[PDB]
Amino acid sequence: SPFPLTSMDKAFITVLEMTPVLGTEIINYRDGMGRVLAQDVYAKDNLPPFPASVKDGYAVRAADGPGDRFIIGESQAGEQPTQTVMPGQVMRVTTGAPIPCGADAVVQVEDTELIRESDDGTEELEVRILVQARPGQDIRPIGHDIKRGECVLAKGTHMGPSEIGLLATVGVTEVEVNKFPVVAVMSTGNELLNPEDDLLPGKIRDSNRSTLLATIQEHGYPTINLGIVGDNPDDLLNALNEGISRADVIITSGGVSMGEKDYLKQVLDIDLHAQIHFGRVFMKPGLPTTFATLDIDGVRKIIFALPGNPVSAVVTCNLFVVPALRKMQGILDPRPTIIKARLSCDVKLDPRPEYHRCILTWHHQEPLPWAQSTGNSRLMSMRSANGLLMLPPKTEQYVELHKGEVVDVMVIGRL
Amino acid sequence: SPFPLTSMDKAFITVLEMTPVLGTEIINYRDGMGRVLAQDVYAKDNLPPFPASVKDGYAVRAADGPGDRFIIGESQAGEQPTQTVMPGQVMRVTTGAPIPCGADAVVQVEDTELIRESDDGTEELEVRILVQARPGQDIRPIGHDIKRGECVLAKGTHMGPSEIGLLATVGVTEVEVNKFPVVAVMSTGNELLNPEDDLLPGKIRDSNRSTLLATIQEHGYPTINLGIVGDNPDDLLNALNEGISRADVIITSGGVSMGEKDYLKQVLDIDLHAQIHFGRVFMKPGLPTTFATLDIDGVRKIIFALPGNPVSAVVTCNLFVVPALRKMQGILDPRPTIIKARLSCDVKLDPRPEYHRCILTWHHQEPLPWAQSTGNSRLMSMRSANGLLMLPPKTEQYVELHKGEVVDVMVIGRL
Numbered sequence: 137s138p139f140p141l142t143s144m145d146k147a148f149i150t151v152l153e154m155t156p157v158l159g160t161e162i163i164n165y166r167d168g169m170g171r172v173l174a175q176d177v178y179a180k181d182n183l184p185p186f187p188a189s190v191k192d193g194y195a196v197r198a199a200d201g202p203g204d205r206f207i208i209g210e211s212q213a214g215e216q217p218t219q220t221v222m223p224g225q226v227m228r229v230t231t232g233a234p235i236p237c238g239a240d241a242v243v244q245v246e247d248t249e250l251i252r253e254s255d256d257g258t259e260e261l262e263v264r265i266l267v268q269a270r271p272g273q274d275i276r277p278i279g280h281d282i283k284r285g286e287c288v289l290a291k292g293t294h295m296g297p298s299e300i301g302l303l304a305t306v307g308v309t310e311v312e313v314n315k316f317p318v319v320a321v322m323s324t325g326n327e328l329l330n331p332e333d334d335l336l337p338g339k340i341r342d343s344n345r346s347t348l349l350a351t352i353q354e355h356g357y358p359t360i361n362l363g364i365v366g367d368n369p370d371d372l373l374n375a376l377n378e379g380i381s382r383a384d385v386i387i388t389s390g391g392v393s394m395g396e397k398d399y400l401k402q403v404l405d406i407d408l409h410a411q412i413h414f415g416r417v418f419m420k421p422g423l424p425t426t427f428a429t430l431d432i433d434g435v436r437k438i439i440f441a442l443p444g445n446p447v448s449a450v451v452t453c454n455l456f457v458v459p460a461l462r463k464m465q466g467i468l469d470p471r472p473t474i475i476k477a478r479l480s481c482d483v484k485l486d487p488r489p490e491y492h493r494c495i496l497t498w499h500h501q502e503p504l505p506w507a508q509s510t511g512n513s514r515l516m517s518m519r520s521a522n523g524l525l526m527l528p529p530k531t532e533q534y535v536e537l538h539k540g541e542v543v544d545v546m547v548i549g550r551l
Numbered sequence: 552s553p554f555p556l557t558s559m560d561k562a563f564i565t566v567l568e569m570t571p572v573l574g575t576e577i578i579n580y581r582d583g584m585g586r587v588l589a590q591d592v593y594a595k596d597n598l599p600p601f602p603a604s605v606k607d608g609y610a611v612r613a614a615d616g617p618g619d620r621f622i623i624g625e626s627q628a629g630e631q632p633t634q635t636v637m638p639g640q641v642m643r644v645t646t647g648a649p650i651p652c653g654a655d656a657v658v659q660v661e662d663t664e665l666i667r668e669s670d671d672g673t674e675e676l677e678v679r680i681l682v683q684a685r686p687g688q689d690i691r692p693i694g695h696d697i698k699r700g701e702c703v704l705a706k707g708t709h710m711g712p713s714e715i716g717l718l719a720t721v722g723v724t725e726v727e728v729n730k731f732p733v734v735a736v737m738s739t740g741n742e743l744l745n746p747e748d749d750l751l752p753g754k755i756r757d758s759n760r761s762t763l764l765a766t767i768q769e770h771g772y773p774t775i776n777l778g779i780v781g782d783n784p785d786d787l788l789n790a791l792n793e794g795i796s797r798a799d800v801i802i803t804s805g806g807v808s809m810g811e812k813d814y815l816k817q818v819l820d821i822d823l824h825a826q827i828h829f830g831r832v833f834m835k836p837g838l839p840t841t842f843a844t845l846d847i848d849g850v851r852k853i854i855f856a857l858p859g860n861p862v863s864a865v866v867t868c869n870l871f872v873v874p875a876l877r878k879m880q881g882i883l884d885p886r887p888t889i890i891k892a893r894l895s896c897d898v899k900l901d902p903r904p905e906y907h908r909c910i911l912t913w914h915h916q917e918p919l920p921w922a923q924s925t926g927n928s929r930l931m932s933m934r935s936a937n938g939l940l941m942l943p944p945k946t947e948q949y950v951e952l953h954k955g956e957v958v959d960v961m962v963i964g965r966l
């Protein structure tokens with residue numbers, strides 16, 4: 137064309153605006169990790185469903201006050217008691233056991249002294265209550281934690297272990313959630329060999345497919361490996377159609393600059409009839425990053441055609457692809473987390489906004505983490521990149537950023 | 552006993568010191584995510600393996616300087632060229648294509664003007680070189696990025712997508728790594744019903760098993776569901792033996808306090824013959840947290856018997872279990888990441904160090920995140936807990952922490 141230089145902000149907003157939210161499905165709660173609820177979840181039981189002891193000790197009548205009491209029996213966990221505590225009496229309780237009728241408080245064993253037990257030692261007979269219990273003391277009334285009819289999880293909730301536990305608690309074992317996107321990845325280039333291949337003259341190994349697939353899998357999404365496609369329109373079109381058939385998202389790398397054998401934009405526009413929203417981004421690296429949508433049968437397929445350069449591919453995957461996938465799986469605010477960090481080294485600014493993988497480290501008591509760019513100590517190289525340095529365009533004023541200065545870092549890995 | 556109150560530091564150090572590092576195994580590189588290399592990895596080829604163009608343009612003799620040149624042919628990606636560029640000649644090159652013999656520089660197409668092409672438009676015949684190229688300009692010599700024999704990944708490296716990509720690049724598709732721990736989880740209590748069950752009198756649903764399993768699975772480790780075990784020594788012993796047989800790690804919850812039917816410590820010591828290293832921790836919550844090891848046939852099994860209270864169970868799982876699992880899978884420094892954050896609310900300190908799940912949020916330009924404790928707005932409850940507030944013991948001086956004050960937060964989720 138060549139396509140107009142799209143600002144990073146416009147590119148990003150465009151990606152998020154044009155990316156659809158996937159439909160819903162019912163899953164088992166155990167499979168809920170990373171999923172977004174598409175329904176409100178309601179409790180059908182009280183928690184606790186019975187008045188429950190907070191302590192190991194004795195269920196008592198507060199009105200009896202302190203004194204020596206006969207132990208008429210035991211309320212054990214999982215058993216509904218049958219006896220009624222009368223004045224002068226108490227019942228042994230364990231944590232979480234039901235409070236028997238007639239008792240209105242629990243006194244913990246520490247606030248008691250044992251008077252009499254069986255010759256065996258099996259059974260407590262008589263106990264001294266040393267304190268004045270307040271009514272309701274150390275008891276969880278019915279519904280104290282969760283009431284029947286209460287909404288315990290709202291739609292839009294991004295679920296982790298505790299939410300799964302809550303679902304378990306209220307017995308809601310099937311829930312409606314957004315689907316996860318199925319993401320197909322292909323590499324392009326006549327020069328590319330499989331990782332498993334010995335080198336041949338003029339060839340190199342395909343690395344982008346592995347890196348991109350791993351990046352997507354790290355976020356929990358199912359993937360499809362479309363292999364290596366040669367630099368020619370027919371094969372590219374066929375591969376793209378396959379991806380379209382098998383997946384919600386297609387990621388390609390390579391062939392998006394203006395070289396003689398860079399065919400992706402051509403194929404996307406002319407042959408696939410997709411709508412290219414941008415074909416160049418004013419960013420370093422990632423200049424030729426291309427974003428397209430294809431509407432078939434009321435379904436929007438999304439296509440990221442990333443640059444062939446490996447660094448560019450992984451960086452742009454992290455900047456554009458992951459947020460899109462996050463929106464598709466129903467996350468309401470799909471933006472990545474951005475944090476403030478101190479630069480470990482000086483850095484020259486480019487007229488384009490710059491992006492670089494880094495490692496975030498927190499030092500013993502210093503409030504801000506340090507961001508160390510990868511590529512350039514022993515222990516540091518044994519850590520995977522967990523940040524993406526986001527450096528601003530140079531200006532007539534500011535030309536270079538110095539060690540210790542605060543910059544924005546996008547989180548791309550567990551810290 | 553009751554077991555001595557173990558300080559948090561001592562408990563943690565004890566866990567890490569007593570936890571073994573698992574043996575190694577060979578995996579396919581695609582399965583490398585989250586794995587730790589147990590070997591150094593060496594490149595057997597140069598990258599690039601041929602002198603490679605950095606630009607789309609023309610391979611030239613720098614000594615010819617600027618001027619009009621005949622295009623004798625094309626070096627295309629994946630093809631070893633055969634022709635030799637002579638004085639007055641150039642060859643078209645695309646990015647990553649081999650540099651033909653006789654050429655010592657590349658001039659990008661922007662620094663040229665096309666003079667003559669074929670009547671078809673298929674083929675460039677004559678081009679004007681507008682610049683004086685420096686020798687070696689825009690060429691990657693053989694081995695520039697990676698040299699044959701170079702160690703590209705060191706043992707001890709915790710791998711993410713980029714490492715997998717590097718493995719792909721150097722064609723090392725099988726690697727030695729540490730095994731992942733297999734983790735078995737059981738719940739205990741006569742009062743517990745499965746999540747799938749309707750409630751019966753005196754009963755509640757088992758939530759800990761789901762929460763703990765989900766927590767472990769979130770970190771990538773395979774798990775085994777040992778179900779619900781009643782409060783009695785025989786069944787507990789059988790379940791424990793099953794876990795021992797099927798797994799490297801056993802997590803139980805419940806039955807570790809001093810209640811009448813709390814049998815875990817007894818069973819662990821007397822019946823299983825495990826070595827309990829601590830049975831109480833001076834912490835809130837998690838007082839009765841119990842840690843044991845069992846050495847069989849030169850293999851150390853590790854057992855975490857966590858408190859029954861759900862909050863206690865998830866908190867202590869995050870404080871003690873995950874770091875242990877991180878050590879077992881070969882991570883050299885298994886400590887979790889701790890960050891500084893500002894409290895969103897005032898909080899009373901306890902004589903014990905306090906721990907609470909929270910949500911970390913970064914505000915637009917403020918350097919430090921805010922930590923909001925869970926449980927007590929609309930949008931915030933739709934986010935999973937990603938932090939664990941670590942609050943210090945109260946002192947005669949400091950009794951309460953105030954809004955805005957900086958505290959330690961342990962990262963437990965993607966931010």
Ligand SMILES: Nc1ncnc2c1ncn2[C@@H]1O[C@H](COP(=O)(O)OP(=O)(O)O)[C@@H](O)[C@H]1O
Binds near residue numbers: 232757758807860861
């Ligand atoms: N798996 C579980 N799910 C939900 N609640 C549980 C679970 N296990 C125990 N509890 C509850 O936690 C509380 C403490 O149980 P207990 O077994 O006495 O813990 P401890 O380990 O302190 O002895 C009780 O109210 C009990 O019902």
Ligand SMILES: Nc1ncnc2c1ncn2[C@@H]1O[C@H](COP(=O)(O)OP(=O)(O)O)[C@@H](O)[C@H]1O
Binds near residue numbers: 389390
């Ligand atoms: N999958 C891949 N793995 C490793 N290197 C690649 C891959 N795809 C492309 N490359 C390399 O990246 C560079 C740019 O390739 P190209 O397809 O021209 O990218 P662009 O998208 O900028 O046109 C070339 O040197 C090429 O060999």
Ligand SMILES: [Mn+2]
Binds near residue numbers: 325326391628
């Ligand atoms: Mn290419």
Ligand SMILES: [Mn+2]
Binds near residue numbers: 444
């Ligand atoms: Mn190209």
Ligand SMILES: [Mn+2]
Binds near residue numbers: 739741782806859
């Ligand atoms: Mn119990």
Ligand SMILES: [Mn+2]
Binds near residue numbers: 231805807813
């Ligand atoms: Mn107990």
